[PDB]
């Protein structure tokens, strides 16, 4: 199952 | 910008038997960046119908791909993998050597 939150560098 | 030259191996899925259907494999690994040109050759000419794995990478971030095609080896027919990459001044040909 993929990660469900959005992270940005 | 770190660049790494591909390691190339050409081999069959199964031990080669003349007249018996098999898969010709060309495995490229340890390369960066990901854009790479891989051809399977039969008697020096590009095989047009060739499949490949989904691009992935190792702990060191270096990429690996498998190019493959169904094929029937014979005594006389020669096979090779031709690889071009930014790290190479010319495309590298590795011949299929069945008897390793």
């Amino acid at each position: 199952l993929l990660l469900g939150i959005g992270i940005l560098v | 910008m770190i660049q790494r030259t591909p390691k190339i191996q050409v081999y069959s899925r199964h031990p080669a038997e003349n007249g018996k259907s098999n898969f010709l494999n060309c495995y490229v690994s340890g390369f960066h960046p990901s854009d790479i040109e891989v051809d399977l050759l039969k008697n020096g000419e590009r095989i047009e119908k060739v499949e490949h794995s989904d691009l992935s990478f190792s702990k060191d971030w270096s990429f690996y791909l498998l190019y493959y095609t169904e094929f029937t080896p014979t005594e006389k027919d020669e096979y090779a993998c031709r690889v071009n990459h930014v790290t190479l001044s010319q495309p590298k040909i590795v011949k299929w050597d069945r008897d390793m």
Binding site: - | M1, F23, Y27
Partner: protein
């Protein structure tokens, strides 16, 4: 006994200002089970193993939404990193991301990962504590300060210790026949006369799973590295792996040399010797 689930994401801006490539691949151990590739015109997260095809439409809709969301954040990241390193749009740049979890023999959380590379080198990595970051360079410290202030590690910790491991267990149970198997290496030795003076002994391992294997040469029971050759473990293309180790030996000294094979599929480590 011990297992891992891993997602691997490659984001490539190509020369100029075209749309970047995005590819996502999911693995359980050494078995790919999902893919999405912009170069293959993917519109959905696609199965790559029959056991994951059994998941229903809500699974596939959700994974498709999330992988498209990942594609979007990588598209931002490419622009962000051009800015951080003062690079023009004209060049080709590569972002890689890997996240996942390992479980031990008891199937409990052992370890979590969440890390990036830029242009073939470390950028930033979640440390083992799942609370702190390793910024590889000055530019990555900007990312580290941002992710600390936003408590990103704490959100990742919830997924890596919970969801990631809960779903890895589900897959291991649903894909049991495929994922919880070991295929022992089929081993043999070849002999090729290099000259009148030397012979190559090649020790072969075929059709094994998982990929993890050790091939070592001994000479009269002592570890032997000199005049040895070891190729990368390679895929057969049917879900099994291959590997060989070779040594060049003086003519008439073949019998001193043993190849040692270790694989979790074997009852016991194997010893091969060249035989007339």
């Amino acid at each position: 006994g011990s297992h891992s689930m891993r997602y691997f994401f490659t984001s490539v801006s190509r020369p100029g200002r075209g749309e970047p490539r995005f590819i996502a691949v999911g693995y359980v151990d050494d078995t790919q089970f999902v893919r999405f590739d912009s170069d293959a015109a993917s519109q959905r997260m696609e199965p790559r193993a029959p056991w994951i095809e059994q998941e229903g439409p809500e699974y596939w809709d959700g994974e498709t939404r999330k992988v498209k969301a990942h594609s979007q954040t990588h598209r931002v990241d490419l622009g962000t990193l051009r800015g951080y390193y003062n690079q023009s749009e004209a060049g080709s740049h590569t972002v890689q991301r890997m996240y996942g979890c390992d479980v031990g023999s008891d199937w409990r959380f052992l370890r979590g990962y969440h890390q990036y590379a830029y242009d073939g080198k470390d950028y930033i990595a979640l440390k083992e504590d799942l609370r702190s970051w390793t910024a590889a360079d000055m530019a990555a410290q900007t990312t580290k300060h941002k992710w600390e202030a936003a408590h990103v590690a704490e959100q990742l910790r919830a997924y890596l210790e919970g969801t990631c491991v809960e779903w890895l267990r589900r897959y291991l149970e649903n894909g049991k026949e495929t994922l919880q198997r070991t295929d022992a290496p089929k081993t043999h030795m070849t002999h090729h006369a290099v000259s009148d003076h030397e012979a190559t002994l090649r020790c072969w391992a075929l059709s094994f799973y998982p990929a993890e294997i050790t091939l070592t040469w001994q000479r009269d029971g002592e570890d032997q590295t000199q005049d040895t050759e070891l190729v990368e473990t390679r895929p057969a293309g049917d879900g099994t792996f291959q590997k060989w180790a070779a040594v060049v030996v003086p003519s008439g000294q073949e019998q001193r040399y043993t190849c040692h094979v270790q694989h979790e599929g074997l009852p016991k480590p194997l010893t091969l010797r060249w035989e007339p």
